[PDB]
Design a protein around this nucleic acid. Structure first.
Length: 118
RNA sequence: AGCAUGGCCCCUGCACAAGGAUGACACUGCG
């Protein structure tokens, strides 16, 4: 009953159920989301890799960029894999130490899924 | 899939704050 991770993030796979019309539009939704926020990504087979060096989708990030700030970046690096298995969209966190960037990306992705579907 | 704690995506906001909305959530505590 060891606890060497008594406060580490214990959720690393995020899943979203997808109806037929989501399953059909998942590709255009994903491309829009990723390219409208300038998010680096590449195809690694049946899987997408996202490698970010800084948060670029946050409202805070928009405030920092659209404003001339002394530091024009909110850094924090993270890698994650996007997949579709069993009519579910999965995002697995595969690299990084800051969980908040990965959960921030997940929250924005979830918002994208609710918006471009309704 | 309760209550507390917390942050996340979105809105207001020069910064720090403080709100608002909302859905997906989560470290641990009551247990």
């Amino acid at each position: 009953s060891t606890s060497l991770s008594k406060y580490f993030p214990h959720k690393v796979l995020q899943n979203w159920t997808l109806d037929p019309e989501l399953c059909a539009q998942i590709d255009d939704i994903l491309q829009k989301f990723l390219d409208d926020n300038k998010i680096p990504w590449s195809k690694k087979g049946s899987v997408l890799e996202i490698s970010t060096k800084s948060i670029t989708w946050s409202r805070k990030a928009r405030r920092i960029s659209k404003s001339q700030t002394s530091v024009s970046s909110l850094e924090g690096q993270m890698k994650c894999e996007l997949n579709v298995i069993d009519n579910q969209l999965q995002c697995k966190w595969i690299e990084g130490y800051d969980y908040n960037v990965y959960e921030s990306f997940c929250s924005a992705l979830a918002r994208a899924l609710r918006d471009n579907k309704k």
